[PDB]
């Protein structure tokens, strides 16, 4: 019946559904209106999921397992995987096939395995509330997630056993909840996410024609390297900087007391938040042949603000970039919103107010917006949300270069996503043993008038006379943007693809010129492509 919204972070997930008109976050057990994306697997063998999990973690860093969402749907060589396996305190692994995953107690499990013990509790917390059995879901992913992390993240909610209703990216979301508020129509707005795993920018438009919202991203950017657990890291190693000056001990080969830093600092940092100083305070940390040692050490906020200002500052340039990509200027966004809790340090909503002349909205809760926001795209699913339409179109018609330097159309501008289309196209010359698929992107009949996205050739053509080769080509453009063009040949069984990415913003003001640009020239490329029409259309070598 009903389909709840959750927000599976990198460090906390929430769980709410539409009450009627209303969204409502759920709490779980505890009380807790978010539950810490943490799995643990305890000596006596059974499951720990959230808080029990984040209670013990400091005594079994081996099995208690966090941060998976940086290695969902990523190859173990991947430099971010890589990168993670040096420090995190559990044990990843290359799967046989190369994927990254985990390795506790000897069992080996794929990061989907380890999430999905997540959203089991955010589905029980649900069935809680209503007090019925709850199998459908929309689930969110950041903006910056590819196929395959998209992929592996609807097979955690299948593994959750949840029916995946929708995918949708955390700013819509995010967006979606903020929309609900009366008065958001026909407005441009920023979506500032600085999460426990990244910082992601949005630009989003929400505008309202003719009784319907509609809302649809106008550009997006993300890094990895700019997330809350990297305020952390400059954090601890302030600490064991600190220790060390102190009394001469790097804890950093140390693994208990490494573990039990990093929360210590965690929580340092976040009061900070609402402190001008705060007391990191370790009993027993270590010892060595002179007896037990203990810490204590005085963070005050202004150290802590110089030892993130470059990370603070380094969320700007992306701002600046999701701007250009939109072709908007600052003076066109009429609200900007924070998303994630490591907005709520001061110096972070300083900087963002700086950058965009005006203070953020106050009204959009940082930590359930995502979640709402999904429960809002499940309540549009039931008919519960009416005249709301989440807007994702091709801004300029998709195609090939065929014979005579034409663009030959396989998905037109403004074609709803996810969408595909297929055409079955033949050889140019007697015995063709390969054609090259060139995607173009463009409103004008000349090939070499539009933009480029890539090429690619399928060989293996049997000899046979021009046009009587079956060569089908298929546009497919997934839910994440994503184009996937194929090359097949129908009576050889050879096919060869390729993937184009999303771009990284719409340009309204560069795509209307090029509309009108296209206008401007419909008779000219008419009678080009007429006369090229005179010699099933056909792909030359
Ligand atoms: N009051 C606070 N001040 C500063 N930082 C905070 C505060 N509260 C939480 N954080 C930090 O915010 C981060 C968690 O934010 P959030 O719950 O929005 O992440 P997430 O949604 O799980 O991550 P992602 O969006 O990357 O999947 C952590 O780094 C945490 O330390
Ligand atoms: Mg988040």
Redesign the pocket.
Request: proline share 6%; charged share 30%.
């Given at each position: 019946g009903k389909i709840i919204g959750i927000?599976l972070?990198?460090?906390?997930?929430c769980v709410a559904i539409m009450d009627g008109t209303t969204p409502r976050v759920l709490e779980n057990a505890e009380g807790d209106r978010?539950t810490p994306?943490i799995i643990a697997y305890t000596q006596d063998g059974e499951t720990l999921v959230g808080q029990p999990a984040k209670r013990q973690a400091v005594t079994n860093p081996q099995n208690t397992l966090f941060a998976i969402?940086r290695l969902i749907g990523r190859r173990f060589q991947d430099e971010e995987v890589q990168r993670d396996v040096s420090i995190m305190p559990f044990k990843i692994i290359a799967a046989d096939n190369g994927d990254a995953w985990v390795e506790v107690k000897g069992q080996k499990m794929a990061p989907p395995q380890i999430s999905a013990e997540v959203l089991k509790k955010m589905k029980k917390t649900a069935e809680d509330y209503l007090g019925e059995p709850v199998t459908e879901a929309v689930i969110t992913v950041?903006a910056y997630f590819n196929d395959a992390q998209r992929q592996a993240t609807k097979d955690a909610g299948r593994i959750a056993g949840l029916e995946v209703k929708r995918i949708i990216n955390?700013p819509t979301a995010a967006a979606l909840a903020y929309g609900l508020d009366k008065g958001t129509g026909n407005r441009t707005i920023a979506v500032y996410?600085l999460?426990?795993?990244?910082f992601d920018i949005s630009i989003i438009e929400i505008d309202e024609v003719d009784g319907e919202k509609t809302f649809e991203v106008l550009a997006t950017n993300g890094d990895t390297h700019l997330?809350?657990?990297d305020?952390?890291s400059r954090l601890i190693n302030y600490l064991v900087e600190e220790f060390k000056k102190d009394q001469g001990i790097d804890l950093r080969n140390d693994p208990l007391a490494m573990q039990r830093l990093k929360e210590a600092a965690?929580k340092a940092?976040?009061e900070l938040?609402?402190a001008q100083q705060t007391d990191v305070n370790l009993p027993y940390i270590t010892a060595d042949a002179t007896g037990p040692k203990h810490m204590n050490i005085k963070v005050t906020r202004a150290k802590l603000e110089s030892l993130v200002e470059d990370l603070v500052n380094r969320s700007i340039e992306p701002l600046k970039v999701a701007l250009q990509d939109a072709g908007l200027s600052v003076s066109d966004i009429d609200d900007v919103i924070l998303?994630?809790?490591?907005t709520?340090?001061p110096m972070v909503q300083k900087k963002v107010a700086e950058f965009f002349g005006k203070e953020p909205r106050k009204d959009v809760n940082?930590?359930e917006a995502?979640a709402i926001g999904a429960a809002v795209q499940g309540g549009v699913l039931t008919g519960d949300v009416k005249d709301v339409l989440l807007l994702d179109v091709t801004p300029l018609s998709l195609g090939i270069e065929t014979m005579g330097g034409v663009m030959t159309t396989l998905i037109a501008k403004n074609t709803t996503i996810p969408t595909k289309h297929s055409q079955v196209f033949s050889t140019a010359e007697d015995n063709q043993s390969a054609v090259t698929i060139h995607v173009l992107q463009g409103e004008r009949k000349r090939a070499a008038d539009n933009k480029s996205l890539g090429q690619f050739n399928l060989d293996g053509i049997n000899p046979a006379p021009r046009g009587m080769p079956q060569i089908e080509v298929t546009f497919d453009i997934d839910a994440d943007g994503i184009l996937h063009v194929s090359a097949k040949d129908k009576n050889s069984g050879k096919e060869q693809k390729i993937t184009i990415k999303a771009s990284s913003g719409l340009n309204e003001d560069e795509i209307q010129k090029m509309v009108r640009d296209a206008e401007a020239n419909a008779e000219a490329d008419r009678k080009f492509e007429e006369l090229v029409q005179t010699r099933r259309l056909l792909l030359t070598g």
């Open positions: 927000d972070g990198t460090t906390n997930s978010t994306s969402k950041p955390e996410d999460g426990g795993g990244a997330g809350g657990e305020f952390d965690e940092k976040i938040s609402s998303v994630g809790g490591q709520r340090m940082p930590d995502v």
